[PDB]
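Board notes, transcribed. Complex of a protein with LQT.
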Amino acid sequence: AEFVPPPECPVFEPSWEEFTDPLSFIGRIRPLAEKTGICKIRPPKDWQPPFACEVKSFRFTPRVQRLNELEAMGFEQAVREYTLQSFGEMADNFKSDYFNMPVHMVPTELVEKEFWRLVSSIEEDVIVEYGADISSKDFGSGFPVKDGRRKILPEEEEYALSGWNLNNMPVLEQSVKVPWLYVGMCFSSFCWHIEDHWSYSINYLHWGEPKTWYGVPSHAAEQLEEVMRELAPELFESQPDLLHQLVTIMNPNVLMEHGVPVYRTNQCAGEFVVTFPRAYHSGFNQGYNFAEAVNFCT
Ligand SMILES: CCN(CCN(C)C)C(=O)CNCc1cc(C(N)=O)ccn1
Ligand SMILES: [Mn+2]
């Protein structure tokens, strides 16, 4: 029948004392959040970093996503370049035309149920566009940085030096890496995957409509992979996991019916989402938004 939402993942609202060091804070919430595989962190209300990207120079070519492509089992889609403004106008027009109502009036539960119906629907073909893996080096980070390429107002300095600035997260693993940008739209999505080297990942939503997340704890990772390889198409069964997780999209209720724990959440503007080592995660955007993510080491 209709989609059944997984239980909600933990939300943390640290005080200013607990918000000092991200690594220490993440270490303290670990015994809980590691059981859900993902968690949400709302910074104190007075923490409000400005958006540091250069908007007039921001240009990208998003990738075409067909929601039902796996159910359908190369001239279909014509790819186009956007600015931030022109993408937002296209994104907002798509959502309001699809649901026949203003974009901010569409309930998050309604986009969720419709997304998973469209994923499995062979009767309807919905095409969206996903701003994807845009390096922060070209346009600059969404956070103010001290690199000296622009700005840094006096009010901006504390955010450029903040440990919660994603450019300041430690990227280096001990042995004998820059943030990435995502311009989202309804329904654009990321499928089930883990980070390289089972790394942590932290994700910040600068502005826009929410990003919906699903996540699985690391102790269930093998269970997810077994259900995946069981129900995945045969041609992709023998593919290595690095190539497999490009196409692996599965209704969370299907995982839950096989006993795999799955947790959900809606990441709104100004909120962090942390994924723990080897925690499988997936999701989709509710609408036009801008997100920044980096893999970090502890
Ligand atoms: C740290 C960013 N990155 C690139 C690093 N790779 C070079 C390893 C990733 O793969 C992260 N995984 C993709 C992803 C996207 C989104 C999104 N579109 O909001 C949410 C969660 N995960
Ligand atoms: Mn990820």
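The pocket of manganese (II) ion (ligand 2) is lined by residues 193, 195, 201, 281 (CB under 6 Å). The domain at 1-298 is CATH 2.60.120.650 (Jelly Rolls).
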